[PDB]
Design a binder for this molecule. Sequence first.
Ligand code: 16G
Ligand code: CL
Length: 230
Amino acid sequence: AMSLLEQLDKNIAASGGLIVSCQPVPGSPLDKPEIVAAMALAAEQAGAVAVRIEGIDNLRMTRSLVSVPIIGIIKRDLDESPVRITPFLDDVDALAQAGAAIIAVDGTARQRPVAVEALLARIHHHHLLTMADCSSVDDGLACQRLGADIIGTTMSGYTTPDTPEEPDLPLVKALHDAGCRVIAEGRYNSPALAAEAIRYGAWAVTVGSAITRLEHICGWYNDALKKAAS
Ligand SMILES: CC(=O)N[C@@H]1[C@@H](O)[C@H](O)[C@@H](COP(=O)(O)O)O[C@@H]1O
Ligand SMILES: [Cl-]
């Protein structure tokens, strides 16, 4: 029996280290739990080392089909706080009972209903792995110090207006060099960009829109096609 992290280490070396976030566009014809589960299974068959799944209905359906680790989250829109990713202790509890192997939480220093330390503690005390979705060197190192197993770059570009087009590669290297196990996540919209994250020190790379958001991909094509007519 080898630890989940040790298994992922070996599968990343063998396969590449792709994690597919299977989150279709809200309202999409493709946003159905059976379709999310099928996307996750397809990703597993294609060599993904893990999948990210949002929501309990999607998680329950996916759990049945996949054998790779599931990173679970629940997204919420809070009345005042800008935090969205797994903000509540009850959300941690629900993901743990529904079969997530890793639970990710927003790791930012922002107004929020539950302290980051408390969310991480709740996950660990379900005997699951923790992932802190971080935005900066400072928040990432704080979450490292709180004992998060994995630091994601998921929130970089999303705490302040004007999200950059390019992914935040330097953050991957800063966190890696500081001793973090880093998942690069956010705007890795081509295989070429994902490879650059590896070059910057990523342990694995999570890709969402470019694989599982058909409408979003169509938009990128329309943008380019329209400019070429202009
Ligand atoms: C297609 C895709 O993966 N887009 C991600 C979204 O999944 C994530 O929720 C958000 C986090 O920022 P937020 O918590 O401020 O919305 O970053 C990006 O928008
Ligand atoms: Cl996400």
